[PDB]
Amino acid sequence: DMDRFIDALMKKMTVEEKIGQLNLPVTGEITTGQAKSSDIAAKIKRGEVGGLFNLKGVEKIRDVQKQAVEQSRLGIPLLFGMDVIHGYETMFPIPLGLSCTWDMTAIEESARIAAIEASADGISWTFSPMVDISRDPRWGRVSEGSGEDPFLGAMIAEAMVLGYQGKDMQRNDEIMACVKHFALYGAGEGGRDYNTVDMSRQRMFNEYMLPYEAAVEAGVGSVMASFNEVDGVPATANKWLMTDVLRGQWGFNGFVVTDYTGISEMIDHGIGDLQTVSARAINAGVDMDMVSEGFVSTLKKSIQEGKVSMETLNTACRRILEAKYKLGLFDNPYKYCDLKRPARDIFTKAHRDAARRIAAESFVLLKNDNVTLRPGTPAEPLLPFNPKGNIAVIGPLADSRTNMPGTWSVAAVLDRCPSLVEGLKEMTAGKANILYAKGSNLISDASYEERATMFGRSLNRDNRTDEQLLNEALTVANQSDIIIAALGESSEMSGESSSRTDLNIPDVQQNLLKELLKTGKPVVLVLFTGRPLTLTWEQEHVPAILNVWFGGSEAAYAIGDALFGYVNPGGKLTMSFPKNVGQIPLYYAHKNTGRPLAQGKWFEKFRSNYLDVDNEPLYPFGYGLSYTTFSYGDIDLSRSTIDMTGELTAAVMVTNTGTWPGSEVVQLYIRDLVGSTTRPVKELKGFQKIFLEPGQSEIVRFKIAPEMLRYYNYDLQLVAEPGEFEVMIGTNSRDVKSARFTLK
Amino acid sequence: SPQDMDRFIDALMKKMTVEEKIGQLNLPVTGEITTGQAKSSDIAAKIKRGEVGGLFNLKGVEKIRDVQKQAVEQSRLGIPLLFGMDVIHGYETMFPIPLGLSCTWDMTAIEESARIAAIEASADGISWTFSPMVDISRDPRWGRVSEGSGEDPFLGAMIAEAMVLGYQGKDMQRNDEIMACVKHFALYGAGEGGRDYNTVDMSRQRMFNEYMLPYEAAVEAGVGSVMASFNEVDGVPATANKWLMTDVLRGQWGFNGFVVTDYTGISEMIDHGIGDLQTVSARAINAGVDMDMVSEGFVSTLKKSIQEGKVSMETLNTACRRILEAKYKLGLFDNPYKYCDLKRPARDIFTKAHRDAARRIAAESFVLLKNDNVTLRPGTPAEPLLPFNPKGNIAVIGPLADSRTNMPGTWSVAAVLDRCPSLVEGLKEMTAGKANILYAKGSNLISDASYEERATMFGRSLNRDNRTDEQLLNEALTVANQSDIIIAALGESSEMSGESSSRTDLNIPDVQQNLLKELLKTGKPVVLVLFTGRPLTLTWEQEHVPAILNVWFGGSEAAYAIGDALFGYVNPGGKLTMSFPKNVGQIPLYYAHKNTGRPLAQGKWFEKFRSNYLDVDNEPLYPFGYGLSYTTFSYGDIDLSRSTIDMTGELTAAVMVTNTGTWPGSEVVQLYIRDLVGSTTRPVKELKGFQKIFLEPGQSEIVRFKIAPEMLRYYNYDLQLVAEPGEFEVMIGTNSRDVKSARFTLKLE
Ligand SMILES: O=C1O[C@H](CO)[C@@H](O)[C@H](O)[C@H]1O
Ligand SMILES: O=C1O[C@H](CO)[C@@H](O)[C@H](O)[C@H]1O
Ligand SMILES: [Mg+2]
Ligand SMILES: [Mg+2]
């Protein structure tokens, strides 16, 4: 059926036309790399274009599809691609923030909505999800992932692929997804984007690979090859990755696209000239060439010289044609070119309300200490509070529209998003006064601020000095009843090519924060960030800290919802927050070492520890507070022993012991006590997000079976070994209840 | 003969019970030196029962002789003991810490320092040193960088050879030659977070191209023993890693010696999480580990394992034979008391000749990092602060100004710490009658007293008192404002580096940097004499201090050597062997890095969509091979004897180096090669040669390097050590950053 159709089409094709299906030039207003493609009208005519990307607007896409359908010899329709990462126009939180919902239904929903919007506007293909594991918060691209953990990363990868594609991409509101960046890109040395990656095969499989595999097994249509080398070979020329693992081991039936000029960049990597690396890429299992024109300009010559087989070419071409067929583009090239759809599907109130809900769900309450508010009274937390009197909103993130959506919002209308001040003004009209002061620049260094606010994120820095801005803010702060310090990163301090060697709140903002605290007014830190920051000073001195990541186009409203208690925060961290950059890499699923430092023993000579800080993150994986409290009973294991075909249930009663209704992410960890290789001190193996009224309890039950206990041993065999296991359940990866069982 | 050894050992082993064979594999700890937590007990009775193969941490020929006499006269078979110690950079005469010593780029001096240490150690009963430490590291957070020779495997390998040869000589036959022990096999310098003992993980390709060569070089130089490392490799503690300890070490490299564990390395595998004591002990001996340091895994569990078939008699016999062979090769069956001459210590230890050598080698190790011109007096053109004639009032200020015990450096376990002159003491002696040495402590080591305590353990107290920072600073400023020049003696205490001394920030500590700022504010000329066991983050100091001399830890004669440099008796010629980062967030920085697919071109920081950071450029403050002189050297263009060679060929790269300044001095001329295109990505350069030359003012020398295809080999994707045809770039210069370039082509034919 498909096979026969594609056989017949391919029998007609010239070598040039087969090669053309593998070519993906760039166009439009959206800029995601340096090199630009020329002469696109003619190339479509010559049959030399497989797809395009970065073109926005159903009408413009329709026009281009027409040229392909009507002006090329064979009429083969184009794929239309875009980075639809965490929204099209309705922007959800950045993926890292979104991961802190621990809510696969919400995550699927966000992808569903983005697909509806993008498909309504002509897009058939998104370069998403980004599933790279990272333990290095220096790397700006942590903003695009789902944190450090592969179990949670894998579940999220599945939710995103399903949200975008549905069952089989048959509907006109379903699009093809693309798991990226295969593979290991999050382990770039120094946290410096694009830098050398190196690790053992054992680490690859146990620690980094699961999310890519989960996407493949969820039926993801395409895979993007990464910029990094693996084992000294750029991923785009690594046949072990792109054929042996991807196809041979996991059974991937789709196609592989490069990242931006990934082929020609192999010249700079230092593995040969354009022809050589182009031939190596297609022979490795790469099917589509993003921008470099390596395939289109050199593959014929390589075929003539016997460096690439006609077989290899036909396979690459076939995979591209199968993707087009599966999307329904041969049945109808204009499947996604309904000019009536943008008006009914894009940036609707329904979509924006969903984004607002998901944003509030993504926030992580890091601290909410009791503060003396009125003398004589027992100390109470600052959050939540009723919007009354004068609310100061101060800082460089307080009145920026364009920094609200987050990095990788290329189709968003940035200056349509309400700033925090605008959203809070709306939400408190008639009830409180919102008093604004800028307070500081983003950072002292003007050049830094300029590059940190590129892609239209300017904060309109002017000639007012740090001291002037501070003084104005203190005048405002001292007229107020409470201070909302809106501080942290600009959105483009994270994302692609946005690596940091220092992870503090920037200098002038931290100074501003210190001065606001010195007023004696209550201070809430509303923290904008795309990554873990080093917050030990803020943890010591600020009473309340709400990590809002970048919450999307409706962030301002969601922040209001959290501050005023309309939503009780329930986010939990998915990446460790280190005390300093000298502890990197810090991650919860670490080996014990031969000289573990016992709890509370810092400092101890001859143990694995530092002279100047303990081994712990400030906030561990899975950490997050609520306006209520939860209490855990002891773990009930249904068996003390099981065999390889058996099973048990781990159960724990969770009680809401405070005064607020709220959600709790109950987290399941397992430690394999003894291994033929060293095993992590714990691994996340399940979770359940529960909602409880005050005083209400729920018995949370986890099924545990031997398949969950498997790991890649020294010989890379995926096996569960007999022995003892420790089951841990708790409110984060640090504070847990424990019980043990034996596998026979 | 080899056959005589086999016959003798065959005969001895025929006598031995299983318990006696197991006993040869047992290495308890005793004596006054502390290098770990666990301690041994009942050693006298254990030796009597034949349950002890060697001991370590026992100092003094009288004590060692007594113990050897018990082994020889009172055990059934009289098998003599090995006596081990960490003789790392000196016995009593202390040379610079190894990392400092590596900056001499002088293999003759390095060999000499090991020779002297062996002479002193052997005089005092020691037959075995746990040295050299040859671990590659790119992570200056790790305290043990102090013990190695930097980031580079080419230089690392040459130093490993020099050290082994210095200790052992041709074949350990002489009574002033001892058995060496290459450590820590393997990859221990890549521990995550720079945190000692932490997880190591890397590809096999990285192991062989970037980390393994120095171990291999020690093995090929005939090192008698290998110490297994604390870290895991491929998820297996090195002490249980049969691929490391058998397949690589014996299978690939032909190692003929024995493997000892590190301190309780076997029982620590329980904590690593790979099983109980019996299980991990069986795995260790089966892996190729021959001697058990302290844990008593072998002695307490091997017989049960042999009964149960978990370890074979053949495996026990092989391990025992290796130990007996080491003892045989050291001459201990010929004479158990070879090293127990009670009269040698008085004539061989801490002699003037030894100490004069140490003083010379210390001055040779220092790295001049900065020496800018300063205007001392209106109307006189500006000149550098260093060197200066000792006259007037010379202030020496800081917590490292008057500490004897912090001079030798970490890993000086046999030194008499309180006998080393302090810097003030040394400079006072050297300037008697010419200058007044003024002194103030100026600051504590660091603001936190608890930190200072752990930083000055092992008898390195700075005698911190309850004076306020104000008292300390005011006294220093009263000194500074009377002085003609200020020597700011700042940096680390010695035990801020070494084992279990990892740091997450690499600054000069808070109160010392505040002191430095205040001294600079006086307007008097300031020379930073920097004590450290590691690269530090020195961007502020490079911007603000006119002269910076890195003296590492120079050893027992450091004070005199520092005087030699300051007063111009020696012209500094040290070159860095490890990159100095601008901040900890750049780690790891190393010169021999891959290009990436998005390289930032020179001078283009910042550029979006290149491999670079938002907040700092990609560069270290000081690159690999960096070091200044009191003179300047200029380099002509490179002349290659031919532009094309094949696998059978060779060429010569030659460059004229001229001393263009006013001082005679040494230059380390460094050869780097870039393999431009590979089947795998190749580093942007690799050190492949060097020559240290001495030139008088105005003098020139043509420095020539032989380049052959064997130098161009590397491990490809399939771990084949191969040279590939293609273009190569030859670079020669004064450091890894500032170089001349020429190209040549390699063909198959
Ligand atoms: O450079 C890139 O370009 C791609 C196209 O914009 C994008 O999808 C990748 O995530 C990114 O690495
Ligand atoms: O712990 C150790 O003990 C050993 C014995 O002191 C020493 O040689 C090693 O270098 C060290 O790691
Ligand atoms: Mg187990
Ligand atoms: Mg080559």
UniProtKB/TrEMBL annotation, chain A:
GO terms for cellular component: periplasmic space. It holds the Pfam family Fn3-like. Keywords: Glycosidase, Hydrolase, Metal-binding, Periplasm, Signal. GO terms for molecular function: beta-glucosidase activity; metal ion binding. Residues 664-733 form the Fibronectin type III-like domain. Its main location: periplasm. It catalyses: Hydrolysis of terminal, non-reducing beta-D-glucosyl residues with release of beta-D-glucose. It is found in: Periplasm. Belongs to the glycosyl hydrolase 3 family. NCBIfam families: PRK15098.1. This is Periplasmic beta-glucosidase.
From TrEMBL, chain B:
Residues 667-736 form the Fibronectin type III-like domain. GO terms for biological process: glucan catabolic process. It is found in: Periplasm. Keywords: Glycosidase, Hydrolase, Metal-binding, Periplasm, Signal. GO terms for cellular component: periplasmic space. It comes from the Bacteria. Gene3D superfamilies: Glycoside hydrolase family 3 C-terminal domain (3.40.50.1700), Glycoside hydrolase, family 3, N-terminal domain (3.20.20.300), Immunoglobulins (2.60.40.10). It catalyses: Hydrolysis of terminal, non-reducing beta-D-glucosyl residues with release of beta-D-glucose. SMART domains: Fn3_like. Its main location: periplasm. One of its GO terms (molecular function) is metal ion binding. Mg(2+) binds at residues 675, 677. InterPro entries: Cellulose_Degrad_GH3, Fn3-like, GH, Glyco_hydro_3_AS, Glyco_hydro_3_C, Glyco_hydro_3_C_sf, Glyco_hydro_3_N, Glyco_hydro_3_N_sf. The keyword Metal-binding applies. Transmembrane segments: none annotated. The keyword Signal applies. Its EC number is 3.2.1.21. Belongs to the glycosyl hydrolase 3 family. This is Periplasmic beta-glucosidase.
